Write a protein that binds this ligand. Sequence first.
Ligand SMILES: Nc1ncnc2c1ncn2[C@@H]1O[C@H](COP(=O)(O)OP(=O)(O)OP(=O)(O)O)[C@@H](O)[C@H]1O
Ligand SMILES: Nc1ncnc2c1ncn2[C@@H]1O[C@H](COP(=O)(O)OP(=O)(O)OP(=O)(O)O)[C@@H](O)[C@H]1O
Ligand SMILES: Nc1ncnc2c1ncn2[C@@H]1O[C@H](COP(=O)(O)OP(=O)(O)O)[C@@H](O)[C@H]1O
Ligand SMILES: Nc1ncnc2c1ncn2[C@@H]1O[C@H](COP(=O)(O)OP(=O)(O)O)[C@@H](O)[C@H]1O
Ligand SMILES: [Mg+2]
Ligand SMILES: [Mg+2]
Ligand SMILES: [Mg+2]
Lengths: 239, 232, 140, 399, 392, 248, 238
Amino acid sequence: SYDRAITVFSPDGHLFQVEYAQEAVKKGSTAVGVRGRDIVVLGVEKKSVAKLQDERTVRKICALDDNVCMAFAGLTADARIVINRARVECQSHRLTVEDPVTVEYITRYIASLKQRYTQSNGRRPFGISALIVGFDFDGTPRLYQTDPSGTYHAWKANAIGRGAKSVREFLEKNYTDEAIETDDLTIKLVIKALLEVVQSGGKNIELAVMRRDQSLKILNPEEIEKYVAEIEKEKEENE
Amino acid sequence: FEALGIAQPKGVLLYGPPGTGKTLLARAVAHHTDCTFIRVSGSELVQKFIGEGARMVRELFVMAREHAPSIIFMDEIDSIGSSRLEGGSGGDSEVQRTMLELLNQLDGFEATKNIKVIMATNRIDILDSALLRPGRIDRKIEFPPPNEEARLDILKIHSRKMNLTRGINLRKIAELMPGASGAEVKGVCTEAGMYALRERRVHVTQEDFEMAVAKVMQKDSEKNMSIKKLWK
Amino acid sequence: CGKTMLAKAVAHHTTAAFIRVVGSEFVQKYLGEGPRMVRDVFRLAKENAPAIIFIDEIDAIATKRFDAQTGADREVQRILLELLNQMDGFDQNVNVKVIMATNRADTLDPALLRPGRLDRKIEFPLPDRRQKRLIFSTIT
Amino acid sequence: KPIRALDEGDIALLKTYGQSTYSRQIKQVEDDIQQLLKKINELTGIKESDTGLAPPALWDLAADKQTLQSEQPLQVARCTKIINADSEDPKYIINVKQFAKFVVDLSDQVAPTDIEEGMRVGVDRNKYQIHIPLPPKIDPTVTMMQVEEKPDVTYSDVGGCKEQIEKLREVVETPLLHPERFVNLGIEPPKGVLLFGPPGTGKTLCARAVANRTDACFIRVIGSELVQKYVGEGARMVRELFEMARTKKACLIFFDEIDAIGGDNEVQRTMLELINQLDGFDPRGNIKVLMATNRPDTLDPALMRPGRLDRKIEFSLPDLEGRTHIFKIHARSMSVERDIRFELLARLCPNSTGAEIRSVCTEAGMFAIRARRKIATEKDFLEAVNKVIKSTPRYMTYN
Amino acid sequence: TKGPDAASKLPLVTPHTQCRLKLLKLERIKDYLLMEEEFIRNQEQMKPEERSKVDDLRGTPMSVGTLEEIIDDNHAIVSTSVGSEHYVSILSFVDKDLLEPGCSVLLNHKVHAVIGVLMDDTDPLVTVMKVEKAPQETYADIGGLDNQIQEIKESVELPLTHPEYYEEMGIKPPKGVILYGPPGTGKTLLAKAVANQTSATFLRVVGSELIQKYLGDGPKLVRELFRVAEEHAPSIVFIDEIDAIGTKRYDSNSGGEREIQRTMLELLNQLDGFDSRGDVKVIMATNRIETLDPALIRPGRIDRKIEFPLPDEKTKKRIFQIHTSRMTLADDVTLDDLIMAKDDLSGADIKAICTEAGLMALRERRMKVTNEDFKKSKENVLYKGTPEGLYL
Amino acid sequence: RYDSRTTIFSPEGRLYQVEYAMEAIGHAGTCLGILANDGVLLAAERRNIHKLLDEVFFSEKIYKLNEDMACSVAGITSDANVLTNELRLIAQRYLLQYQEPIPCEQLVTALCDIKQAYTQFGGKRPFGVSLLYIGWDKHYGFQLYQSDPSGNYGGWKATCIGNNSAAAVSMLKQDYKEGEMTLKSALALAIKVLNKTMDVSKLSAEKVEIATLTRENGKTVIRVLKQKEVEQLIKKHEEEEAKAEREK
Amino acid sequence: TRSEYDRGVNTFSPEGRLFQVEYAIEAIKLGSTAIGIQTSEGVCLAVEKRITSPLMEPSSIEKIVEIDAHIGCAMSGLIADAKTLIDKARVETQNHWFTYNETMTVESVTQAVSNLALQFGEEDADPGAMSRPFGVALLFGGVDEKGPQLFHMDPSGTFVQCDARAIGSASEGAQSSLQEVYHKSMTLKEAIKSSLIILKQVMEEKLNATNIELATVQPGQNFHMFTKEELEEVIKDI
Ligand SMILES: Nc1ncnc2c1ncn2[C@@H]1O[C@H](COP(=O)(O)OP(=O)(O)OP(=O)(O)O)[C@@H](O)[C@H]1O
Ligand SMILES: Nc1ncnc2c1ncn2[C@@H]1O[C@H](COP(=O)(O)OP(=O)(O)OP(=O)(O)O)[C@@H](O)[C@H]1O
Ligand SMILES: Nc1ncnc2c1ncn2[C@@H]1O[C@H](COP(=O)(O)OP(=O)(O)O)[C@@H](O)[C@H]1O
Ligand SMILES: Nc1ncnc2c1ncn2[C@@H]1O[C@H](COP(=O)(O)OP(=O)(O)O)[C@@H](O)[C@H]1O
Ligand SMILES: [Mg+2]
Ligand SMILES: [Mg+2]
Ligand SMILES: [Mg+2]
């Protein structure tokens, strides 16, 4: 029919292969990114390793450059490929223009790459969705979401993967101007958004934070328990 | 069950590879129960006359209810209840009607009481989801091929009536049957007995069991080595 | 290679009640009549003296079970399942030996090819050397 | 860890141990409740049926005894081939329902003239001779044959099928209203049209609208009726309805769901009888037939042959203007605001049939009821069209 | 017509916690039952020509037939149950105004003249198809499905109760409603809840029950069922497993398939027969909605289509609260790890999980279900996707 | 249906050709590797030794890639050879470019990128081969990685792929004491796993293929267990099992 | 049986219709309404945002983009396909400014953009290009030597001079309204009022600041996209 062909329009004008690739992201794992006044955070749901998998190489949050980071959801191999291409392009852009790559440019490159991978037969679309975060060299908080279709959008705080709709509604009901006044408030917001779907807390949660140009350090497993303890303390404080 | 606050489980499915003990377990539970056991082994509810299968299901359940707490054994349930096929034309529809009547009897508007039911099949994966659904079938029991200890137990059960010779090591025979169903173990016992019979003796030796294992478990392998070496 | 002839010879040299059926005969036009015929033939063998059931061309109905997607395939698999449950089902049979001959054993359902249903799968290979001499002598 | 079967001691302890002191009393009382309810249902019973005995003012008991003794009971049968009676072979094949078929003579009461093939013959029980023909006397106010004289729907009510309504206007009005024009153009008036289109398009409604405009009575016949129990004498059904239409003034015959009839022994009798009532009946009559089904091909090939049903009107799913007109028509009968953007709703439901539109309006009414509001709002219509129609993908890649 | 003969509906005892108040309420109900039985028995004890001659005229036995036509006031066309039909007379004492095509006339054994009419004929099948004891399940026993319950109450309850809104808005009441979804979602439970709370006659039907062996028995059974529903108005007809007969219409070759198609065309015709303003509604449930005929679900026949999705997280926890509301759980049981696990748990699956956890507790000689018991139970009852590693 | 060329997406989002490449590994010979405190090993099953195989070979399942690299193969033989040749090529290319032995992560990612490219585009069947890379580096000492036909990979300390791999890995995780296994304990565990996962009451040394990587005195040595060595190991295990059963 | 001619763009129907191109045409009806009007004082472009979530940053949704200071654009269709079309339009405008050192007319802009389009059925796609028709409709407006000029581009590559054209999910209704509400000497202010009136009449949601992006081009000023305050001023009158 009209489904098994990437470059064939359906009678109702749908490229159903592109939509199927988009839906393949929903089978991934939840990843929410929030941008604040001075911080941008990347909260993802970490799959619990059974007994032997090395968490060091199950990387879900990866840094394209010193000024940009991103979290994906939907296909690990396609994600790895697009990550390598994104860092190669970041280095090439810094070679061509000598200034660090803005979040908009790298997001546009990723979107264009995925698009050019979904415009011809014999090229399966990249079945991942990316949440580009980082600061431009002028110091502005920008967050971007790239779709498997090859399009990108600017979000203040978006979620991808499975259960992304629920986290989206949570952020709609809880994203306020004062909620990003301090870094700890943004951390509380993103942790609450994650616990909306991954209710166990503690483990199964990975956070990466970006202040103004510090070469982000992913929150190591020594204060994530501390941060969730503060979250629980506040949770019993208001109730 | 009442004080626990739970609802009584109703049906169990006995699935597994053929010759593992499903029908044997049903026979045993029929032997050792005070309930009025019922054998409604599959394809007996498939009648030529239209709508007779559903009527037979209704009469079967009304009779099971009329008697004491009863047990219904649907052997080879794969036959009538497999999967509802889309549309008609060449698709089966009357057997689907009988199956749907059985489903509604099992867990429908009426909520039958004390009508515990047992079903068996070799292909659970092809059974319909509306039949495998819990509340209609709880505790889907799997009958895996016996391990070495269980194979030894089956050998000792089926060799109880034989005249074994002093020095028989049934443990070695059990170790000689990797991944062998219980039916194949019984067949091994029978073939060892026949090897004894052919020489017009009454006792059975270890060599007899060894050749019986070789004969019963004999199977066709991949003769072409080239095909077999496709995979590393 | 002598299968049906051996069945004929068995029927000759038997004191049993011999019931001869062919596999395709079981498959009926009306729904549920094939399994009914299987039930009746096995019940006739049971209620009679020690009896023998010979089902020539068993693989006409006893092919390996698969995910049947139409009514006819479902009915044929129902016939096979009724055969299985009649041979080694809940109510065991006494003094009812069943002989079935086929050309393609490998296509038979594994549930049919297990001890307790088919205790012996006897191969009838093409005659070799001595067997060819014996056949030539007994035919000439 | 092997499971251990619950020992009798464990069974005894688990039963009592932690339990309500009242639990025994509760269980006993509940069981007694069930037993008492069963006892009440046992001791009420025997509700008197009181069969249909009229008051004794109407019982002429002697007369009923005499009619029991005298009046013979006649089984009802369906007649068949006349076997060339012509006073030399006064015999007919009659099929006595499920009992059997027979070949029987007449009765002194009946005459050959009123007995032919196909009507209900009352045969006796000894010799099975036909003793009284029983015409079905159908005239069915208990079922279909709408027989509506002037349908309430009008020319304004039908919306969107402007091309369709114009083609219908031509065929069933220009001969009907201006016969002289067809006469002086040297052409037989259009014998009929087959109104084919997807179901729910409204072809029936458009036909009833022109019927109301023609002031000619609208007759709607279903097919499933004479597929189901009222089969057989359907030939006499159409015979009597065509006859009363001849007695009636200018008419408009309309067959909907006729696909069931067209798609066959008694059914074949029905269409050869309508062949006799269309070809045999002069094509100049004012009983114009309006054929209508979704299937354009399932109709029997001998039906649309020239000298019979002559054209075909192809109804199609309403367009944007059609959809908004249907929306306004259906919302007129509803308590809604005066600023509902019906063009918006028509846009939001592309490729939507008229039945889908009426269902959308009904769902909007239900949504308004849900919030306990006497007036339906535009948001209710939006939610209704979101529910009925469509039974992120279109918002994130398209824009 | 006689009004709705609803179910028995014994009053519900609210505590259910095995306390004194439960004892008080149950003893009160028992007291009222005892004073009812006393009255019925004592009034049975206390206090004790033309009819006999008309019985003589009727004779013995008297056959039962269905009236189909009435030629004159003294002749009609009755049909015996066998299928044969006769031109018979009507005797004077038969009350004429009750004669209506489709009734149950009483026929003399010899010369089958109409000697009476039977107001209640309902055959054993349609009689058992009528609910007498309301199911104990209630809307309180349904977790989640707030939208589904709301829609069903708008469909089969709001017209039954104060309906002035429906004609105030000018829209018709929804004639018939169909429930669909994956097996075990609550389709039958939601019908039990409706029957428990209804005030109208509830007619449970298996769908496959309507099909009958003898020719013409299927459509006759459907016709009798809906005739009872109308005559029992207001009434609700719950045809569970409609896909038993609701499959795609296809050209029939065998006689049995022709009879099946005849039965469904009769059901569709009689669904069309009554007006939506009538107080008889139909409720149908199925798992294979896609395999239904796209004419039974026409907007002019069954407008509503209530979807039953697999319960979400909050609905899952509501169902768990409902089914563990009678357990003696410990303080350690979180019940949140189970509803966490992204699975396809349904209401039936949750109930089975609770039952299996109880059985694990029994297996440990304890009556207080713990978190470990629930943990093992969830794995035990869940049977049988994407390879692990592809989708992160 | 959506079971055409690999560059297709099921409506639910599944890559069915990739899924079939996944499930195809269950037909391959069973191979496993375990990470010990001071060594790593690869244990593989010789599924096809009928009577007359020359055994002119160093290892069929285990393939050495670099002076610090070794891996075991499980899949189609042709794709196996192609992937091993590409592994050697990329390892030596990294050595030439950087004058340093290639890290395990980098080489595994290179091969997995190649494999993904074979399922990302081109209308080419994905490599139906799953790998178990063994190696050492200064970055993370001893590492074990399990590849995947889909182009994924993972760092493991104990992993079995092939037939009966699910049961083998389940019991292995049930019987793995992380951080406290030497080479001898790892070898005994591997022998026990191969015993429980293969269809033989007493597995022979011929059906078993074991290679051990150990870093000692500045250099990493990759050696396959000689026939005498593997026979001694299996006999030590069978007497240990005899002691266990007589004690029970 | 239209299905055999459905698959692929290089297949002719028995009626000679390019069915895949027709489907690309209909794929415009899935884009938000865009309205452009031609006036003597300039051209105005109004669009519908269709904001999915209040959290979304409005500036990311680019219904109206700048090809050059003298020309404006409005879009309806796939975001990706448009993005490529817009990049090609800007690149060709800069190519003209490089080679001829002049401001290229909007007619030539739409000519070049259509040249990039209608290339799906061509063999020059070997290095890499679109094998399917572009599924985005383009609304080009600006001022050139012929005064202000508005052009609408068809996914098949057809362009036409339109005094007032509406594209998107509601092309039919908005076009029908513009048919009777358009007048030749209509001033720019009353043109913008008319455009906002049509958008309000045709929008699914109510009219506010975040539901519409407004652009205008007049001979004096360059391309101007209406800022927030200008949007409030122009929306308080309506
Ligand atoms: N665990 C066991 N112990 C003893 N005997 C066994 C065991 N399992 C199977 N058998 C024997 O194997 C034979 C096969 O019959 P059984 O009822 O066990 O088959 P089944 O598992 O129901 O197979 P099928 O699916 O073909 O019905 C019987 O004679 C039974 O006694
Ligand atoms: N929302 C719910 N809340 C509580 N219990 C529920 C819910 N849904 C289902 N259940 C439980 O599931 C059991 C079976 O559900 P039910 O009989 O309604 O299924 P169904 O959807 O009609 O299934 P089928 O169509 O497969 O026959 C009920 O007895 C009830 O205990
Ligand atoms: N062992 C044998 N001795 C003599 N004749 C044989 C022998 N085997 C086969 N034949 C000849 O071949 C025929 C056997 O055919 P049959 O056994 O029916 O084949 P199938 O194996 O298909 O049943 C007999 O008619 C006989 O003449
Ligand atoms: N053009 C139309 N104008 C108004 N109502 C319509 C139109 N088309 C269909 N309907 C609605 O459809 C319903 C009945 O459709 P119907 O005429 O039975 O469909 P069919 O075309 O199958 O005969 C009526 O309620 C009617 O209001
Ligand atoms: Mg069995
Ligand atoms: Mg033969
Ligand atoms: Mg149900």
